[PDB]
Scaffold this active site. Structure first.
Site, short mmCIF file in Angstrom:
data_model
loop_
_atom_site.label_atom_id
_atom_site.label_comp_id
_atom_site.label_asym_id
_atom_site.label_seq_id
_atom_site.Cartn_x
_atom_site.Cartn_y
_atom_site.Cartn_z
N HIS A 1 19.71 -2.06 30.12
CA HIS A 1 19.24 -1.76 28.87
C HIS A 1 18.20 -1.34 29.80
CE1 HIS A 1 20.00 -0.21 25.08
NE2 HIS A 1 18.83 -0.56 24.67
N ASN B 1 13.50 0.01 19.91
CA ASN B 1 14.54 0.79 19.41
C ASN B 1 13.13 1.05 18.41
OD1 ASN B 1 17.30 -0.26 20.15
ND2 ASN B 1 17.24 -1.99 18.48
N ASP C 1 20.03 4.04 30.42
CA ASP C 1 21.36 3.46 30.38
C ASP C 1 21.97 4.24 29.41
OD1 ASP C 1 19.16 1.85 28.49
OD2 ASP C 1 21.73 1.04 27.47
N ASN D 1 20.06 3.67 21.06
CA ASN D 1 19.47 3.53 19.75
C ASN D 1 17.80 3.45 20.51
OD1 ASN D 1 21.05 1.85 18.20
ND2 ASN D 1 21.44 0.50 19.00
#
Length: 193
Positions: free
Chosen positions: A22, A70, A95, A116
């Site tokens: 991530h 997020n 990513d 996100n």
């Protein structure tokens, strides 16, 4: 075409996230910063770590939100707004579940694609910024998406991603000098070894 003057890398803070897929966006930006000797410092005002310096004859800012993924827009939005940087002068590295390790693409515009972090930024600056999509693979089922992105890749997959990141790194010169279509051709043409 706008020169790119702000490069953002997305990811989560802390050493438990540092090596997870991530944080592909962080890898690209940290490695860029150190390639050009640009120092990334805590910038709590903008909820992130940031730096500024010369890359290939242009003055570029680099930002890693420290909001958690997020909530990335709580750093990207006020930062770009404070420095009056237009979205068209922004590249966001992130990513990309939908591309395999070792695949990398430059894209301009479009939506978040389910990502996100991008979900938290498109609403506020619009979609017209550039994205460096770093392929991380898809684990094969929606239930495993979370443990995948929040997981460390094995060596083989990591090499491919690093290979792809090194290629994009070598193209930043085109990006900061405004040659986006050329950069796009040349980044997107990448295939491993």
């Amino acid at each position: 075409m706008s020169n790119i003057s702000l490069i953002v890398g997305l990811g989560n803070p802390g050493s438990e996230y540092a090596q997870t897929r991530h944080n592909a966006g962080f890898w690209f930006v940290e490695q860029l910063a150190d390639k050009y000797g640009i120092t990334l410092k805590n910038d709590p005002k903008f909820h992130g770590i940031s730096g500024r310096g010369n890359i290939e004859g242009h003055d570029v800012r680099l930002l890693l939100p420290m909001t958690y993924m997020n909530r990335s827009g709580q750093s990207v939005v006020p930062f770009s707004k404070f420095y009056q940087i237009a979205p068209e002068a922004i590249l966001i590295a992130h990513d990309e579940l939908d591309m395999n390790p070792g695949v990398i693409r430059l894209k301009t515009g479009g939506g978040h694609g389910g990502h996100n972090g991008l979900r938290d930024i498109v609403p506020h600056i619009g979609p017209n910024f550039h994205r460096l999509r770093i392929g991380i693979g898809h684990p094969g089922s929606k239930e495993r998406v979370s443990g995948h992105v929040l997981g460390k890749a094995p060596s083989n997959e990591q090499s491919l991603m690093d290979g792809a990141i090194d290629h994009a790194l070598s193209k930043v010169k085109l990006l900061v000098q405004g040659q986006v279509p050329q950069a796009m051709n040349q980044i997107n043409a990448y295939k491993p070894a």
